[PDB]
Amino acid sequence: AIKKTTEIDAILLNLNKAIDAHYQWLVSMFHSVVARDNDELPYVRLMDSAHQHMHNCGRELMLAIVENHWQDAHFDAFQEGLLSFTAALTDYKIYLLTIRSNMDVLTGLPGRRVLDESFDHQLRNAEPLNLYLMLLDIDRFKLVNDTYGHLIGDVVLRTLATYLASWTRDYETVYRYGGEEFIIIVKAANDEEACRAGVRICQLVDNHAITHSEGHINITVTAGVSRAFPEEPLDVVIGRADRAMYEGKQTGRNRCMFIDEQNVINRVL
Amino acid sequence: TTEIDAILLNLNKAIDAHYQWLVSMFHSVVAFGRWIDHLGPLDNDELPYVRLMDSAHQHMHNCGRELMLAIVENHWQDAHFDAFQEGLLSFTAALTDYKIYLLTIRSNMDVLTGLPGRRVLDESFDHQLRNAEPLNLYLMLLDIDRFKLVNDTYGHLIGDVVLRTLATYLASWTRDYETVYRYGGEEFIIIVKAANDEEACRAGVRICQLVDNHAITHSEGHINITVTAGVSRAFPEEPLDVVIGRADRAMYEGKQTGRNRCMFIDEQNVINRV
Ligand SMILES: Nc1nc2c(ncn2[C@@H]2O[C@@H]3COP(=O)(O)O[C@H]4[C@@H](O)[C@H](n5cnc6c(=O)[nH]c(N)nc65)O[C@@H]4COP(=O)(O)O[C@H]3[C@H]2O)c(=O)[nH]1
Ligand SMILES: Nc1nc2c(ncn2[C@@H]2O[C@H](CO[P@@](=O)(S)OP(=O)(O)OP(=O)(O)O)[C@@H](O)[C@H]2O)c(=O)[nH]1
Ligand SMILES: Nc1nc2c(ncn2[C@@H]2O[C@H](CO[P@@](=O)(S)OP(=O)(O)OP(=O)(O)O)[C@@H](O)[C@H]2O)c(=O)[nH]1
Numbered sequence: 001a002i003k004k005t006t007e008i009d010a011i012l013l014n015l016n017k018a019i020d021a022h023y024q025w026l027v028s029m030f031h032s033v034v035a036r037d038n039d040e041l042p043y044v045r046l047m048d049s050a051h052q053h054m055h056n057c058g059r060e061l062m063l064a065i066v067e068n069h070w071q072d073a074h075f076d077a078f079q080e081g082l083l084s085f086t087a088a089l090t091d092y093k094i095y096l097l098t099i100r101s102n103m104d105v106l107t108g109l110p111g112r113r114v115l116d117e118s119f120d121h122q123l124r125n126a127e128p129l130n131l132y133l134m135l136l137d138i139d140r141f142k143l144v145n146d147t148y149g150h151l152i153g154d155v156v157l158r159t160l161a162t163y164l165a166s167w168t169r170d171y172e173t174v175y176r177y178g179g180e181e182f183i184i185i186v187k188a189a190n191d192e193e194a195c196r197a198g199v200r201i202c203q204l205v206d207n208h209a210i211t212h213s214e215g216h217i218n219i220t221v222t223a224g225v226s227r228a229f230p231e232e233p234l235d236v237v238i239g240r241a242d243r244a245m246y247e248g249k250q251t252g253r254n255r256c257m258f259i260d261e262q263n264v265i266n267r268v269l
Numbered sequence: 270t271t272e273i274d275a276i277l278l279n280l281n282k283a284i285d286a287h288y289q290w291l292v293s294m295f296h297s298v299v300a301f302g303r304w305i306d307h308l309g310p311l312d313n314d315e316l317p318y319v320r321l322m323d324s325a326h327q328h329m330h331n332c333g334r335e336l337m338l339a340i341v342e343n344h345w346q347d348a349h350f351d352a353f354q355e356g357l358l359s360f361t362a363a364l365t366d367y368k369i370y371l372l373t374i375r376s377n378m379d380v381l382t383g384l385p386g387r388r389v390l391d392e393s394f395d396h397q398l399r400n401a402e403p404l405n406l407y408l409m410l411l412d413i414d415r416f417k418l419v420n421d422t423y424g425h426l427i428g429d430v431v432l433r434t435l436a437t438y439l440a441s442w443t444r445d446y447e448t449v450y451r452y453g454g455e456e457f458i459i460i461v462k463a464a465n466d467e468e469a470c471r472a473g474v475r476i477c478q479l480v481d482n483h484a485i486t487h488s489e490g491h492i493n494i495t496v497t498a499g500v501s502r503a504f505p506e507e508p509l510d511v512v513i514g515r516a517d518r519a520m521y522e523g524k525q526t527g528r529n530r531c532m533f534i535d536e537q538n539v540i541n542r543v
């Protein structure tokens with residue numbers, strides 16, 4: 001999808017699980033003889049292809065050994081495919097780690113940098129649908145820090161992060177963009193659909209208090225939604241979404257704003 | 270960071286190397302050891318992980334030798350393969366443990382700046398306060414002034430450079446024993462150790478000057494910045510959040526009053542500019 005750091009460790013685990021599993025596999029062959037999204041799609045396709053081929057050599061190798069017409073070529077071919085497999089994983093591994101070295105420690109959401117690097121791609125692959133960026137900024141969060149302390153503030157962010165991650169779809173990623181600032185990349189058919197997604201999240205934030213050791217704390221967020229037109233750079237879009245959000249804060253808070261193609265702002269209902 | 274990727278590489282190099290090894294044994298029948306000592310005695314944190322896998326590696330090969338000998342001399346048993354596999358998985362466990370440890374320890378280093386992250390400080394603060402004696406400990410919070418403007422003006426890439434640079438400068442301008450942390454997006458913390466509040470404030474105010482007195486170069490020209498800081502004492506047995514909060518209180522008023530200045534909050538919780 002991805003979001004949430006935990007999701008990545010889960011994979012890397014299963015990658016290392018394959019390494020061990022395929023060691024065992026090789027031992028067995030040796031035993032038996034004696035006894036008589038579009039970003040990460042390429043990496044999986046690659047290793048899937050490698051995996052197949054590896055086993056193919058193993059089968060070919062085994063059959064050749066048994067039927068008494070094996071040749072040094074058969075082992076070298078198997079080893080070629082086996083290292084090709086362990087390459088394919090490694091590539092995938094790295095990619096993940098890199099992408100997810102930029103993962104926010106506090107919340108476990110992806111950081112601005114992840115978005116920066118992936119945005120140009122996400123916009124291109126949005127078609128036929130439209131892409132929208134939703135900026136959320138916690139309302140008077142300083143107060144919350146001033147009132148309860150920073151630890152508590154840290155919890156709110158963790159929680160809010162977790163909630164937002166749960167409330168969003170898989171293909172739509174939630175990013176910790178800033179200190180109190182979040183971005184959700186929404187994909188929809190029209191501006192109205194985007195706004196609905198926007199406005200509903202704001203309600204949910206409002207409608208779900210954040211529990212802590214010492215009790216309960218209610219919050220709300222003012223959001224700014226905007227269209228992402230083809231070939232625009234991220235900074236242009238954010239800026240527009242920021243323009244949207246600011247007016248929302250001017251007008252009362254706890255609300256989702258939207259900035260149209262004409263660069264005119266209107267609150268959503 | 271770079272130092273770690275170098276290792277992780279060499280760990281994965283062993284996995285491949287030891288696949289080949291196994292293939293050779295299988296081939297021959299049908300017919301790392303050097304790198305470990307070349308790590309250069311590390312510290313007491315990571316010693317156990319290397320000892321562990323070194324031990325595992327040995328044992329693994331031992332089974333392989335025992336296995337091979339048994340196969341050739343015609344007195345091998347299913348036990349021999351299972352024993353070898355036990356040791357082989359024990360080896361791949363030993364690496365994995367080491368791997369994790371590294372990643373974890375090294376996730377908490379800030380990717381962008383290369384300074385330690387908040388989490389490092391969180392975990393080490395209680396310790397740093399205890400070992401401050403006989404000296405006093407102070408926390409210095411720095412927050413770039415109108416950095417949003419800089420992003421809005423030049424873009425985020427440029428903004429990213431400024432932070433990298435500022436980080437680097439601050440690291441150079443601080444003492445070894447006093448650590449600079451990327452606490453937040455535009456927020457830095459320096460843990461100062463001094464004899465009195467005046468000494469701390471001097472350290473504080475001078476850093477702010479340096480930031481002011483050193484423009485940040487980029488591909489397309491030069492960008493000047495400044496920082497408003499907040500310094501505070503750390504009294505024994507206080508938790509970090511209390512101190513930071515106080516240091517934040519100090520900084521905020523500084524921003525209210527004009528910016529590009531170091532503020533200090535006294536034992537009486539009263540703020541004064543340096
Ligand atoms: N004006 C001023 N600048 C300061 C002060 N403390 C640090 N700096 C600046 O920060 C740099 C880093 O100091 P270091 O990493 O402790 O590395 C230092 C430190 O280990 C040692 N050193 C320099 N001065 C002192 C000192 O007063 N006491 C001790 N114990 N060591 C010192 O020499 C190393 C190299 O120092 P530099 O090349 O000068 O580079 C210094 C200097 O440019 C200060 O109190 N006043
Ligand atoms: N504990 C904690 N505090 C943070 C963090 N990131 C940012 N903050 C603090 O949250 C505060 C947000 O300041 P704003 O005044 S801009 O936030 P508001 O919600 O009050 O702004 P708006 O009223 O919505 O315009 C700042 O003082 C930051 O130091 C964080 O990661 N952990
Ligand atoms: N390029 C880049 N920008 C960042 C980063 N971390 C935080 N920022 C931005 O820094 C900006 C600072 O906004 P503030 O208004 S809170 O900072 P100011 O300096 O304007 O606030 P003060 O006036 O100093 O209180 C925010 O818009 C953040 O998006 C970052 O890692 N890379």
Ligand SMILES: [Mg+2]
Pocket residue numbers: 137138139140141180
């Ligand atoms: Mg806010």
Ligand SMILES: [Mg+2]
Pocket residue numbers: 412413414415416455
């Ligand atoms: Mg600032």
Ligand SMILES: [Zn+2]
Pocket residue numbers: 022051055
């Ligand atoms: Zn398989």
Ligand SMILES: [Zn+2]
Pocket residue numbers: 287301302326330
């Ligand atoms: Zn070996």
